[PDB]
Amino acid sequence: AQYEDGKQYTTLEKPVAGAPQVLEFFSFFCPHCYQFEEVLHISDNVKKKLPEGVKMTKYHVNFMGGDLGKDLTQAWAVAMALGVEDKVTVPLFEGVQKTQTIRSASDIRDVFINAGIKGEEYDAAWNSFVVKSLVAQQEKAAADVQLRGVPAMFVNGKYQLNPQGMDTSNMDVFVQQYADTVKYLSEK
Amino acid sequence: AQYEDGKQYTTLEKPVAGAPQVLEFFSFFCPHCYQFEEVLHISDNVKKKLPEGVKMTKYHVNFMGGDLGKDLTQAWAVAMALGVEDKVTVPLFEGVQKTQTIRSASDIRDVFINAGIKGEEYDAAWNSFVVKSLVAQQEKAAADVQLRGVPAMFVNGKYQLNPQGMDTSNMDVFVQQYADTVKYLSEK
Numbered sequence: 001a002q003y004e005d006g007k008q009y010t011t012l013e014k015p016v017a018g019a020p021q022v023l024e025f026f027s028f029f030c031p032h033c034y035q036f037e038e039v040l041h042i043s044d045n046v047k048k049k050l051p052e053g054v055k056m057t058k059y060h061v062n063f064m065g066g067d068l069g070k071d072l073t074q075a076w077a078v079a080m081a082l083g084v085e086d087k088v089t090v091p092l093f094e095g096v097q098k099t100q101t102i103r104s105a106s107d108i109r110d111v112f113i114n115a116g117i118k119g120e121e122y123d124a125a126w127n128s129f130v131v132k133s134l135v136a137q138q139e140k141a142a143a144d145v146q147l148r149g150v151p152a153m154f155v156n157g158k159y160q161l162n163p164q165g166m167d168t169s170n171m172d173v174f175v176q177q178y179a180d181t182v183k184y185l186s187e188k
Numbered sequence: 189a190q191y192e193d194g195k196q197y198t199t200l201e202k203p204v205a206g207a208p209q210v211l212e213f214f215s216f217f218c219p220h221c222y223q224f225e226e227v228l229h230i231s232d233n234v235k236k237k238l239p240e241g242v243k244m245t246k247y248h249v250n251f252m253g254g255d256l257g258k259d260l261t262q263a264w265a266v267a268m269a270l271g272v273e274d275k276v277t278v279p280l281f282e283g284v285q286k287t288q289t290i291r292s293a294s295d296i297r298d299v300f301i302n303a304g305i306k307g308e309e310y311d312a313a314w315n316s317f318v319v320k321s322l323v324a325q326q327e328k329a330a331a332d333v334q335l336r337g338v339p340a341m342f343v344n345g346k347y348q349l350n351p352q353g354m355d356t357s358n359m360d361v362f363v364q365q366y367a368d369t370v371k372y373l374s375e376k
Contacts, residue, residue, distance in 0.1 A: 039284070172292040
């Protein structure tokens with residue numbers, strides 16, 4: 001590939017210090033985020049391409065979905081705090097976008113219960129200051145890269161992936177170009 | 189049910205002349221479209237309640253899918269041209285969203301071949317003026333109704349279904365409310 005700023009990636013005007021090496025932002029209301037998760041498996045394929053020691057971080061954003069949007073950011077904080085992201089990502093995406101059965105915080109709670117998280121544990125986490133701090137961390141991270149939309153990925157707080165500039169004829173070629181761009185940027 | 193403008197349906201500010209009597213839009217990438225068609229069977233339930241003589245039309249759109257999305261819209265034109273919608277809708281939805289076996293146009297072609305459409309016939313239709321025209325027709329219809337998202341349904345180019353307010357405490361009752369609304373608008 002001939003990597004070029006503006007094509008596969010763009011460069012932040014003011015790089016963020018102490019940023020995660022690979023930082024993804026998403027919303028459970030975001031249609032492309034649904035595709036990135038269920039059909040393209042972007043995070044898994046980026047992980048596979050990168051060295052074993054690279055930290056990948058994934059944060060939820062507030063600006064899709066009204067009040068339920070805020071609740072989902074708090075729920076994603078719960079998931080991070082309990083380490084159950086992989087248990088709830090699909091039923092949260094599908095509950096919001098596919099079946100549209102997630103309408104309130106109670107419905108979000110039911111998803112966690114059905115994914116095996118004990119209700120008492122969910123409630124304790126939901127109300128915890130660990131979770132409150134993770135909510136603040138997600139919001140600050142988005143602010144720091146001046147985030148305007150999702151999905152988004154940032155490498156070393158300097159470079160932003162530009163999927164728009166990639167080939168969309170074949171799903172697996174798209175994923176390969178995306179992951180290979182992350183690898184190129186990571187060792188930049 | 190007591191029908192009111194703004195409740196079960198809305199009224200287009202700019203009516204579309206010569207529109208199909210009942211016009212549905214969808215995308216094979218769209219999870220709620222999968223829900224509508226593969227789980228709720230909205231098209232089929234609407235059809236069953238429609239007055240005799242009222243035909244249903246269904247067009248594909250491309251909001252998410254880039255070049256592959258365009259391929260899907262052209263493949264849907266082939267399905268319309270060949271009259272094989274009822275043979276390929278299921279394996280196309282499953283292949284895109286569930287088994288992730290549809291990654292490119294070649295995989296779409298394989299679905300038609302497996303459904304009984306010979307490869308040379310699929311290709312002849314793919315490259316036909318009829319299919320080129322059907323692609324233009326799908327695009328133009330979406331533009332005419334100022335299509336914002338999918339799924340969507342329009343009656344007589346005048347009325348837009350509004351499922352948001354409908355009873356969703358029960359997917360069976362939702363389907364009934366939705367199909368009854370189309371029947372009502374068709375009679376108007």
